[PDB]
Subunit: 212 residues, 2 copies
Amino acid sequence: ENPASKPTPVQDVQGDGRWMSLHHRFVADSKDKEPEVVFIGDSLVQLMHQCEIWRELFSPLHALNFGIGGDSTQHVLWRLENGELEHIRPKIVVVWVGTNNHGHTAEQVTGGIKAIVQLVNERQPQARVVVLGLLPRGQHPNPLREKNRRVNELVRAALAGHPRAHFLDADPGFVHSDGTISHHDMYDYLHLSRLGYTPVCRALHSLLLRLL
Amino acid sequence: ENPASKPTPVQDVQGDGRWMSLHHRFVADSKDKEPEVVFIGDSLVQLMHQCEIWRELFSPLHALNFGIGGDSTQHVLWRLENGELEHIRPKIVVVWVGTNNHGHTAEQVTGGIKAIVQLVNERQPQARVVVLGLLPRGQHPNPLREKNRRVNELVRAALAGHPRAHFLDADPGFVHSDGTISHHDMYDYLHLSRLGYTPVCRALHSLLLRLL
């Protein structure tokens, strides 16, 4: 198996059960609500709900945010299989995950993203899927930039022939000419500041509006 | 040794060097600035700079935020020893760390907090130190709540006899009568929402103003 595409929950090694609490909250959300758009992924998804305004762009679209910080592809795959797509019939599912897949190759991460798209295509066949590219990270040039770029190439190639599957590069050019990423854009060179989120969210929002 | 009080940097096992970038940024901050207050700790400190307004309460006090998500006590101790207290002469240092010290007992975590206070007392003897209590976490009752409470008891007892060392319980009562924490307060039952931050920041700000 590709570990990136074998669905598995996060194991609690801390003791407070937070990841399963989040999953259960989302399951309840889907049971009780009727979203047009559901967003799922890692902290870049989750903190959009706080740290960008979410309220002005995405709230109007009738959206649920199932981001969880730290998730890898296989965790998002498990969550979609285990309740978060039940009781709903979204028009669009937005996926943003793979930057946390440490120890997986770029090809394995791509297989995890492809597996997520396929599950959504099975469980929610009416939905369009939007996959976001993995953003650059690290203050300076480093292997995860190359990795992330290579996933993006491979995912873009995989989705090119997919009528209702859409790859979106949301990066406005966070890596400057000198190789650096500004902490004004990503405060810790991974996570977006409010300023970082603006261009990202703008780009997503445009696409969503087109599709919708 | 108590692992919580043996200073050690976070080892990069991902490859993008972000933790050392953050440390180096803070070192540069201290080299170039003249804070009256420096805040140091984990993500509860770091995201105050974003996710609470920071700008209206803490900015006026001439403050630097050296929070880093994921740090344990020993990481904060290393960072203070390795450059982040150089070139400055703050009136107050605010410490908030120990919730991430997984695998350390409550007594070991307390020893790490005590070690941090002692280092600040050595390197910046004019400064008052403010330690925040560890907040509850997890949606429901769990061992980390008891752990965190027990650190708070032990730290409060340790600091009681310390003229210029101040323990602040900033918890307004996030654990409700039914044992639960609301995701409106902590979106993932650890990290504070903007709403969660308001009472916390209010309480800190009051204390700071008294002291100052």
